[PDB]
Design a protein around this ligand. Structure first.
Ligand code: MG
Ligand code: MG
Lengths: 360, 360
């Protein structure tokens, strides 16, 4: 595992009361995030959990000292997020003092070029926007499959690699608010109103913000990131996020008629996907595994699958999936497709086909 | 309108603390149900609303006295259910004193021979059972089309006319629990837990029993009767209602795998329909208009439509609809077909066709 001794620091990228991030390299394409006071004596458990949660996507953990019991209980109660192209790359996590130039938590990460709101300061291609949406969906699908909910998706913390600026790579980052517990998965008992519910923010899904507490009384997060994706899809197609600004829709109030119509430039099927994701009732929203497939099929299916027409056969689908694997053996296009083939189960690709047919 | 003076009573059919039903005739094929204490001074609104709701299917209202304001509010807030062969026939409703031998509500109805649970004490034909399911579906489609939910469908109150015992006429009865408000249709704000939710009983649909209260927080009944129809379909094909008995599935828990398999005697397409109706997620359930079409198609379509094959044409569907209208110009058979033709829209008959094809 990589520790401080193996790497050389540069300029600060960010400076704060709670921590610092430094540019870094091995012997400046890495960032070393340092969060201070990772100590049960200098902070309470809610703050420490939030620091550890940031670590959920990490590839390796390394520890100098003998683990305190809270550290052990944290580690053993946590769901791990395996690597994925659309999830932030955290190469090492380690605990260490404020020498080596406060017990501090350290995260060595890839440095990304900008966030999504900066990249969208100039309008991108309509093709670029679809690749962005597909990537986001593909990330959420990966989280949900592994019983993790981000709870704080937003333009600000989606990060991009802008080599080939016509098609960037998107990654979900900043897992500080995430739900990642082995015990309860995506269902979370909500007994007191003074409880961590994720980012208490604009893009909390209606089924979370509107739920009153009780005795199970459960919060169900299994389609909650998806709602946020819907809001963010607006930004991705050059509109205001309906739920941001001074004259502003609110997650708890909004009725589905209040949502702005998307520009005509954005395909009709995709308009519908966005309208699906933004449904108030999570039971009316697609599964993530299906919603990610809708975007992938739009992108790569035979055109006959997309026009009304249409004979669809279990054997023909498999043949098509195998045609795709060969096609990947334009780096974003490769990543998305391999991302899609990794999780493709035949049931869910038909479901997605059936959904596209019913929306024209 | 028919009032007491026009009819002659016979034996009691039922006696209770809350009211009486008498056999009756005009000058004994009618029943005159009398409910006592239809007076705000003798009963609370909850009980009166329940009494009035029993009147939702009624053909004529007649009132001796100047309506009280609570009566006025009841009437103006209520959706009316038009006549329909599979909805109980209530020819007149009138308010009257307990002389004429307590203000009492009176309902003059058709007398039916038995309820569904009695008729099924002997196993009927497999064909008879399909006729029963088709009529029940056709009732629920009629209610849902007019924004009414029964909320208390069960074997005990589905009533039959058993002339021609090979094919009986089924009617939905006992509208005391029903939702029929002009204001809110089938979407009911659910703000306190001590709220009237329909019969708080075994065949409440999962989406109703599982919903917690809040601030909109709505209860959606638009597919709830249909859930109950699924459970009842088991009884209609000689099995135990999965949700009745001592070792018993519950509406809030049951996983879709827990459901007993239906007998091999009951067609494969129909086993699927029952499985659809019993899906926990009301979005994954067919529209009532479509589900009723599935049964009708199974009964009367050209056999080419049902086997895998299969060219289905908008013009050809219309031709087949017109062939049916001529075919009805075996009284249950006539009733079902005319019931199907009255509501047949070209869109929904194709949806149903397409659904049948995908389940084989
Ligand atoms: Mg944070
Ligand atoms: Mg009653």
């Amino acid at each position: 595992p990589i520790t401080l001794n193996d790497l050389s620091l540069g300029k600060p990228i960010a400076k704060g009361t709670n921590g610092v991030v430094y540019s870094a390299k091995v012997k400046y394409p890495f960032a070393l995030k340092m969060m201070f006071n990772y100590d049960i004596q200098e902070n309470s458990m809610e703050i420490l959990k939030a620091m550890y949660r940031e670590t959920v996507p990490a590839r390796m953990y390394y520890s100098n000292h003998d683990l305190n019991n809270w550290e052990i209980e944290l580690a053993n109660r946590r769901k791990h997020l395996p690597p994925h192209p659309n999830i932030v790359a955290i190469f090492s996590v380690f605990t260490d003092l404020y020498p080596a130039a406060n017990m501090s938590l350290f995260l060595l990460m890839k440095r990304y070029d900008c966030n999504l709101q900066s990249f969208l300061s100039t309008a991108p291609s309509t093709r670029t926007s679809l690749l962005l949406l597909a990537q986001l969906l593909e990330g959420v699908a990966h989280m949900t499959a592994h019983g993790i909910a981000h709870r704080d998706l937003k333009s600000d913390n989606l990060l991009l690699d802008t080599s080939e600026p016509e098609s960037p790579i998107l990654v979900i980052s900043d897992f500080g608010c995430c739900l990642a517990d082995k015990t309860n998965g995506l269902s979370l008992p909500y007994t007191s109103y003074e409880m961590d519910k994720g980012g208490n923010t604009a893009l909390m899904a209606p089924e979370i913000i509107c739920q009153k507490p009780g005795t199970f009384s459960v919060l169900n997060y299994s389609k909650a990131d998806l709602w946020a994706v819907g809001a963010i899809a607006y930004e991705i197609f050059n509109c205001h996020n309906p739920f941001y600004g001074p004259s502003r829709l609110k997650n708890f109030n909004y009725k589905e008629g209040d949502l702005p119509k998307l520009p005509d430039e954005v395909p009709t099927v995709i308009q519908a996907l966005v309208a699906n994701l933004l449904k108030r009732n999570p039971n009316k929203r697609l599964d993530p595994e299906v919603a990610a497939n809708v975007c992938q099929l739009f992108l790569w299916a035979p055109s006959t699958w997309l026009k009304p027409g249409k004979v669809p056969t279990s054997g023909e689908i498999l043949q098509w999936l195998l045609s795709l694997t060969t096609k990947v053996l334009t780096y974003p296009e490769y990543l998305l497709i391999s991302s899609f083939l990794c999780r493709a189960k035949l049931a869910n690709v038909r479901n997605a086909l059936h959904w596209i047919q019913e929306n024209l």
